[PDB]
Design an enzyme around this catalytic site. Structure first.
Site, mmCIF file in Angstrom:
data_model
loop_
_atom_site.group_PDB
_atom_site.id
_atom_site.type_symbol
_atom_site.label_atom_id
_atom_site.label_comp_id
_atom_site.label_asym_id
_atom_site.label_seq_id
_atom_site.Cartn_x
_atom_site.Cartn_y
_atom_site.Cartn_z
ATOM 1 N N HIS A 1 0.743 -0.852 0.359
ATOM 2 C CA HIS A 1 0.022 -0.167 -0.825
ATOM 3 C C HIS A 1 0.900 0.957 -0.079
ATOM 4 C CE1 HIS A 1 -2.740 2.925 1.057
ATOM 5 N NE2 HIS A 1 -2.343 3.040 2.054
ATOM 6 N N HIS B 1 1.080 4.883 -1.705
ATOM 7 C CA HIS B 1 0.697 7.130 -2.183
ATOM 8 C C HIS B 1 0.940 7.345 -3.204
ATOM 9 C CE1 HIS B 1 -1.254 7.539 2.478
ATOM 10 N NE2 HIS B 1 -1.558 6.364 1.600
ATOM 11 N N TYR C 1 0.010 -5.585 -19.913
ATOM 12 C CA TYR C 1 0.610 -6.408 -18.155
ATOM 13 C C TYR C 1 -0.507 -6.826 -17.341
ATOM 14 C CZ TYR C 1 4.914 -6.578 -21.176
ATOM 15 O OH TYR C 1 5.525 -6.334 -22.650
#
Lengths: 207, 207, 207, 207
Positions: free
Chosen positions: D93, D95, D120
C-alpha cells in the site's frame, strides 16, 4: 595529492548526474582546470556513472592530449571557453531532458532563452544565449562559444542541450542544475498565467 | 575470468536501469553474446535491480538452455536478432515509460516511429521501425524482428515497448537510453512548434 | 552523543532529498533544534548531497553563530519561525520542482495555496499560506514568516518555494514530501474534473 | 532463519520504493504472510527508506499485536484482505503519484479504473476496482476491501491511492509497479488518440 582529489570529485559529481537522470548514456562530458592550468576532462565513449578517476583525460591549454584515455570530442569547445574567459574554471555539458527540450523550440530568444520567473538563474548565470544548431563536432560550435564566453557562463545549444561554466566544478554543476530546473518549470507551468519577475525585480538581482 | 566480468557488467547495468526508473518490476530482460558465441541473459521472474550474477541464464545459438536459471520467455526474439544480424552483440528490452507510451499511439510510422529533432538517435540507431502488437510470447514477434534485424538496431513493439541492439551491452544500453530520452522529449514538447532537423541536417548524420 | 546522531540524521535526510530530486544544487537548507535550545543548520554554499556532519552550523536562539561552517543566509527566517512557534523543532526549506512551480502562479490564495483533493496535507499541515516575493535574503521574508508562524507549519514563498516546519526533522521532512507531492498532483491533474474533498470531508480531518 | 530473510526482504523492498519515488514520507505500509500464518508489517510512523528489520511489526491473523513496534493503522484492512483471499500472501500500500492522481478523478469506473492499452496489468491483476473515499482509518475501508478481496488482487482507494496484493511480497511489489506505471501512461498519453487493446486482444490475456 590535489589532482587525485580533483579526479575523485569529477568522478563523484559525474556519478551524481547519472544516477539522478541528468546524464543519459554516453551523452555528455565534464572538464575542470587543474592548478597548473591543464585540463581534466571525461574521456570519450565513457559512461558518466562509472568513470575511472585514473583514466580521466588530461589536456593542455593548447589542446595537446597529455595523459589518460582519449578525451571527448566536445573538449574542443571546452578549450574555447577557457581561452576566452579567465574566470571559467570548469565546464559541465549534459543533454539533460528539459534543457534539451527547450533548445528544440522555434522562436527562441538567442540572447536569453528563458524569461525569469525565479530569481536564481539570473543571480548565478544571468543571460543564457542560444548557440545555433550544427553537426556534433562542428568547428562553428566552438567558434560561436568563444564569441560569447567573455560575458556569459551558460549557453543553450539548439537541438543539443546546455553548456554551463563555473569558477569551480561544484559551481558549474550547481549552475547546470538550476538551469535545467528552470527549463523544467517552463514546461510544467505551460500556458498557465505565470507571475514573471518584473524588470525592477530583475535589476535587484544583477548586482 | 571474462565471463565473470560479463555477468557482473550485466548485473551492474541491470541495476542501473532499475534504480533510475527504466525498468518496472519484472518487466524486461537483457542479453549479451559471450566470446564463444553463447548467450548470457537475465532469467525469467527476475527483478532487474537484484540479479544474481552466477544465476544468469546461458543459452546456445540454437536456443538450448545450458546453465543458470530459466531464461526469460522474451529470449526467443533475442535469438532472432542474433541470427539475422552478425553485428548485434547485445539486446536490451525494457518497458520504459515514454517509449512504451509512444508505442501506444495511433497513426504511428512503422518505418520510423520518431521524427528527429535531435541528432543523436539518427547517428546511433537511425530508423526505429514499429513491430505489430501480439500477445506476449507470440511466435510472430520474433519472426517480425528477424525480418528487420539485418538493417535496424532499434525497434518499437506496439503496446509493449522498445527493443534495442548494440555491438556491446554498454552500447545497447546507451542506445536504449537515447531512444527513451527522445520519446520523452516528444511528449514534453507536445503541440509546441518544434524545430525539426531538416532533410539536409539528417543526411549529414547518416554518414 | 545525541548531538552526533542529530548531525548524522540531518546529513542522512539531506542526502535523501538530494538523491531523490527534492534538492537542486546548493539551493536549500535544513535546521533542527538541539535539546539545549541551540540550532543545527546546514552551512552556506553546501551541497545537500555531500554534507560533512562535523561541519554543520550551530547557531544560538539569538542568532549568534557558535561553531561549524558559516550558516546559510536563509537561517535568518529559520530563527523567526522558532521564536514565534514553540512547537516548531525543525525547518526544511527546499526549492522542489512542483512546489516552486505552484508558487509562480498568478491568482494564488495567500491563505491556503492548495485546494485539498487528498486528505494528508490537511491532516498534517492544514493551511499553506503564501509569503510574498522578495529578493532572497530580504528582511521582510523573515518578518512575514514570523507573523504566520504561530498558527501554520507550512509556507509557500512566491517565486521561491516551500518552507515547512515540524516537531522533529523527520516530521518536517515528511510534511515537506507530502506538500511537494500534492503540488505535483495539481499539475498532473491539470484541467481534468477533480473530485475535491467536500467541506464536510475536510472538517473530519481538522480534528 | 527464514523470518530474518523475510524481514530483510521487506526492508530491502521498502527502501527500493522510497529511493525510486514510489513512497512519499511516512505515507504507506507493507505486509507479508509468514509461514506460520502470522503477519510481518511495517510499523506506524516509520519512513520506508530506513526501516529497522528487527523492529518490524508482527500481527496474528486475529489482529493481535505480537511483537515489534506498533503496526500501522492501515494494517486493519491488510487483515481484511488475508481473511477473504487465501491466495493473498502480501499487501503493498503506497500513495504513489500517478495512481493517487488517477484515484482523484471524477467519473471513474468503480469496476475497473483503467482501460487497458498495455497487456501487463490485465495479465497480472485483471480488474482494478475503486474503493470509495473515507476518512483514513475508517471501518468501511476494510469492510469494502473484504468484499472485493476474493476476486481481485489490486484496488484503487479514491483520493488515497492503490492497494495491491500478491502471492509473495516480490509479486505484490511488481504488480504495484505495473499498476503505477499504467496510471502514469494514462496521464502521459492524455487526449492523444490511444490504440486501446480490443476486446479480443483482452480475452487472449485473461487465460
Amino acid at each position: 595529492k590535489v589532482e587525485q582529489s580533483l579526479r575523485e570529485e569529477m568522478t563523484r559529481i559525474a556519478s551524481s548526474f547519472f544516477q539522478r537522470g541528468y546524464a543519459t548514456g554516453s551523452a555528455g562530458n565534464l572538464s575542470l582546470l587543474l592548478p597548473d592550468g591543464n585540463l581534466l576532462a571525461t574521456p570519450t565513449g565513457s559512461c558518466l556513472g562509472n568513470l575511472d578517476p585514473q583514466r580521466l583525460s588530461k589536456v593542455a591549454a593548447d589542446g595537446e592530449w597529455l595523459s589518460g584515455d582519449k578525451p571527448s570530442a566536445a573538449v574542443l569547445f571546452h578549450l574555447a571557453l577557457y581561452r576566452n574567459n579567465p574566470r571559467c574554471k570548469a565546464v559541465v555539458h549534459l543533454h539533460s531532458t528539459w534543457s534539451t527540450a527547450l533548445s528544440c523550440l522555434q522562436g527562441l530568444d538567442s540572447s536569453n532563452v528563458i524569461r525569469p520567473f525565479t530569481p536564481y538563474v539570473v543571480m548565478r548565470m544571468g543571460n543564457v544565449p542560444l548557440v545555433p544548431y550544427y553537426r556534433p563536432g562542428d568547428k562553428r560550435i566552438a567558434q560561436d562559444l568563444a564569441e560569447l564566453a567573455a560575458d556569459n557562463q551558460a549557453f543553450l545549444l539548439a537541438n543539443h542541450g546546455p553548456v554551463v561554466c563555473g569558477e569551480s566544478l561544484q559551481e558549474a554543476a550547481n549552475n547546470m542544475e538550476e538551469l535545467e530546473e528552470t527549463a523544467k518549470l517552463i514546461f510544467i507551468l505551460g500556458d498557465r498565467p505565470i507571475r514573471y519577475l518584473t524588470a525592477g525585480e530583475i535589476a535587484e538581482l544583477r548586482s
